[PDB]
Each structure stands twice: as structure tokens, then as C-alpha cells.
């Protein structure tokens, strides 16, 4: 079935691979060569998770967990039941995500729109890969990656973070969190502002973007404007994920001690290092 206005857009064209061969839809979904690739990778991955489930002895989705090879395997391959499935499943995941992005590109091409969406998605993919590929490779073992389990992955987060003390002290992590909190603030404000203009007081005419600028100028002395706010959301989100990947790629590689101690470079600057008073004298 189609949206009422959809048919006019369902023209041939825009594919990156295969010409017309996979240029079609299943229901609402566009297929494309990358729809087929996504299906193959996702399916194989899911099948291999199920086999891992069988080798672990459970079907409970809150218990199924696929762990990377132990640290002793380094960056080699491991027997399938002892990290190899994780390795193949990670190949499937990466294949599925990149395929999903490229399918998104084929959709943008058919629709005549910018490529901003899959470009944004690529930041998420690169954060994933920082955790499962780049960081482990720099650290010298697949076993530094996170396991694929709903709860066991949180175990990895807590264990990894406390390896460096309170992870809050990672300065890149502080920036990342600030972007995440700022992004949610901006999302709440943006959704609120547009709804407050589109749904004004009872019986009143819809407001205009002029009213939106006015409201913000009145409240804080500045309005970023209707184009700006979308630029801003996109930047805040992607900056958050860039600084997340950054905060982890430096952890265990260039800095591997307690993060709290990083801050001593500042306290110990010679012009004030020895001055009495304060918390540090």
C-alpha cells in the first residue's frame, strides 16, 4: 500500500549497483542491491546468534550473550564457540549497518534529497566500530570489545569504566556528555517551540516562525532561527558521538592510568604548583 501522495515518487532510478534488478519495493520498504545485502548480513548474523544461543544453552533473550575471544587469542581467530561466532557476527553487523547506510543513499538519490541522513548514521557506525574494531586492534586483542548481550554489555561498560577509576574524569567523556545533555535540551526546546506555534492558545490562529524567533529573543535574548536549530541538533548529536568515540579510542591506548590523575598536569604547573592554600596545598 502507498501513502496518498507516494506514487509520483516511485519512479525508476538512483540505484548504485545492479541497475533495475533490485529497483523495487516490498510493501513500504525500498529494496535495492543494499536491501538485499542488508537482508543477507542481518539474517546470517541472527542465525549465528541463534547458534551461539544453542551452544550457550539458553533461548532467553535476557540471557543470550555472544562474547568476543578471550584476551589470550590476541587478534587471531578463535574457535567458533570460544569467540569465533562473535567475530563472524561482528562482520555481519558491520556489513548490515554499512549496507543500511548505502541503501539510504540509494533512497536519497531516487527522492532527489541531500545525503545528510546516511552521513549522520555513519557517525553511529564509526562509534560502534571504535568499540569493536579500532580500539581492540590498537589494544592488541578482540577481547577488549564488548559482548553482545542485553545485560552482559552493561557489565562491560561498568568493568571498562572502573579499570580507569571514575570514568567521569576522562575529559573527552566530559565533552561528550555535555553534547548529549545539550542535545536533549535542544530537542525538547525545538519540539516544544514548533508545537507551541502550531498549537497556540484555544481559538487562536497558528503562529508564525516570526513568533518563534520572538519567543526565544524574549526569553534568552537570542534565536538561532529555523534553519539554525536543525543545523544545531545535527551538530550536537554528531559531536556527542564523535567525542564518545574519541573518549574511548584514547582510553587504553594513549592514556591507561586512572583518569582522575590526568588533571594533575594543570595543578602542577610551575607558576602555582607550590603555592599554599586551596584543596591542593
Amino acid at each position: 500500500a502507498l501513502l496518498s501522495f507516494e506514487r509520483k515518487y516511485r519512479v525508476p532510478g538512483g540505484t548504485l549497483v545492479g541497475g533495475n534488478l533490485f529497483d523495487f519495493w516490498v510493501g513500504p520498504f525500498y529494496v535495492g542491491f543494499f536491501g538485499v545485502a542488508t537482508f543477507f548480513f542481518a539474517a546470517l548474523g541472527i542465525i549465528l546468534i541463534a547458534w551461539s544461543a544453542v551452544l550457550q544453552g539458553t533461548w532467553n533473550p535476557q540471557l543470550i550473550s555472544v562474547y568476543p575471544p578471550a584476551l589470550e587469542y590476541g587478534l587471531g581467530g578463535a574457535p567458533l564457540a570460544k569467540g569465533g561466532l562473535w567475530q563472524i557476527i561482528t562482520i555481519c553487523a558491520t556489513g548490515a549497518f554499512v549496507s543500511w547506510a548505502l541503501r539510504e543513499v540509494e533512497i536519497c538519490r531516487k527522492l532527489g534529497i541531500g545525503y545528510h541522513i546516511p552521513f549522520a548514521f555513519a557517525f553511529a557506525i564509526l562509534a560502534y566500530l571504535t568499540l569493536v574494531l579500532f580500539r581492540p586492534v590498537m589494544m592488541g586483542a578482540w577481547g577488549y570489545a564488548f559482548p553482545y548481550g542485553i545485560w552482559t554489555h552493561l557489565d562491560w561498560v561498568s568493568n571498562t569504566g572502573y579499570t580507569y577509576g571514575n570514568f567521569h574524569y576522562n575529559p573527552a567523556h566530559m565533552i561528550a556528555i555535555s553534547f548529549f545533555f545539550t542535545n536533549a535540551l535542544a530537542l525538547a526546546l525545538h519540539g516544544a517551540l514548533v508545537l507551541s506555534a502550531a498549537n497556540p492558545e484555544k481559538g487562536k490562529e497558528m503562529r508564525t516562525p516570526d513568533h518563534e524567533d520572538t519567543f526565544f529573543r524574549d526569553l534568552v535574548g537570542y534565536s538561532i532561527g529555523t534553519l539554525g536549530i536543525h543545523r544545531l541538533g545535527l551538530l550536537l548529536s554528531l559531536s556527542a558521538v564523535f567525542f564518545s568515540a574519541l573518549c574511548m579510542i584514547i582510553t587504553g591506548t594513549i592514556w591507561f592510568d586512572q583518569w582522575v590523575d590526568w588533571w594533575q598536569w594543570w595543578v602542577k604547573l610551575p607558576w602555582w604548583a607550590n603555592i599554599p592554600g586551596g584543596i591542593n596545598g
Partner: protein
Amino acid sequence: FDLASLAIYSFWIFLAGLIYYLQTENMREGYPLENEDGTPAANQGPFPLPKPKTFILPHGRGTLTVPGPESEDRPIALARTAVSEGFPHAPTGDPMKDGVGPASWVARRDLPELDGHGHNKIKPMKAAAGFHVSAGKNPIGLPVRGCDLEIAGKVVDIWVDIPEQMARFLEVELKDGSTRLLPMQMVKVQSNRVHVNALSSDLFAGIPTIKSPTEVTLLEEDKICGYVAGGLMYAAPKR
């Protein structure tokens, strides 16, 4: 008992209701779903259409009530390429001219968007009192080049959003002395030219023209923007 268990159970009931509500609010346009021939689809999904809401439009423009009867309100020059659902529909003529595919336009109202004071929101800069270029390369005067690397015209003004103070279109004069509007988002202002990847020089003539030289209607904007974006797919041939 447990108050935390009550809270988490309650929250999940709440969230299910919230998602149901949000999905139905998002069916205020485009539904009911249709077959490829425009008749109503047999399967509409498990979410029903929401009760209608009415937006009161400013400046005597009336109301919008949604959901309501959906109609394209324009001919669509496409035909099936298969004997079953789910395949592309091929243009029956020139898709740029007919406005299908990525060249598509919507039958918006053939009046200009107005600001909060009821004045036209988008005006040529020459008619916008006090407006001027304030930073960046001023495009007025520059030749305009298409993807065939040939010059199609010259920039004779910028059309500005008055309330949001922003460049929205370039007005480009063609060899015959007429002008067209190009979306700012589809042009690249360089030191010695403005380059337009989407169109080859010989497609500038066919950009939909505006009915009045100092204003642009939402319908006209949609035809102009659609045609220009459609060039990315269709400027192709050549020769």
C-alpha cells in the same frame, strides 16, 4: 507489593499508550493508504486514524482539518512497469516537464507565504527595504554555470526571507532577458561564478516561471524546487 514495581509496570503501560497516540498523530497526512491505482488499500494497519483537528490559518487563509480526504489535485504522468504491486512507475513523457519522480511538486496553495504581519515572506532583495548582503561573496553579477560547464545566465538579485533574514533564491537572467529562480541550497557561489550541478545550461529555460515578478507563491516554489532537484537524476541525457 512494591512501589517501584508498580511504577515500572505503570510506566510501560503509559509508554505503550504514548506510542499509540504518537503513531496516530503521525497519520494525519497521507492516510488512508492506497493501492497503486489510487483506490483505498485493503490493509490499513492496526492503528486507526485520529479524530480530526483544525488549524486556524492566519490572515484570512482559512483552516486546515486533518485527517481529511486526500487528493493529489494534479495529473501524474507515470505508468506501471509491472503486472503486480511494488515496482517502479515509468514517466510517460519528460519527467522534468511533467514533474514526477525527483522532479515532483505538490499542489500547494498558489499564494505566497506571509509573515506575522501579513506581508510576503520572500521578496527580491531590491524590494526589501534596508536589506543587503552582509557577509560572503555577493553573487549578484556573477555568471551562472550548469553541469555541462556552459553559462546559462547571470545573477540579477537575491530573493530574501524578510522575517528570518536569509537568502532563499538567486534570480538568474537568461539569454532571452527573462529570469528564473534558483534555490540557494542548489547553487555554489564561487569567486567568479555560481555553479549549479543539477542543471545543464539548456535546462534553465524550462525552470517553471513565476506569475508575478516580485513575489513567489508556495505552488511556484514547489514547482521550481522540484524541477531543479530533478535535474540530478534526469539531466543525464545529453545528447
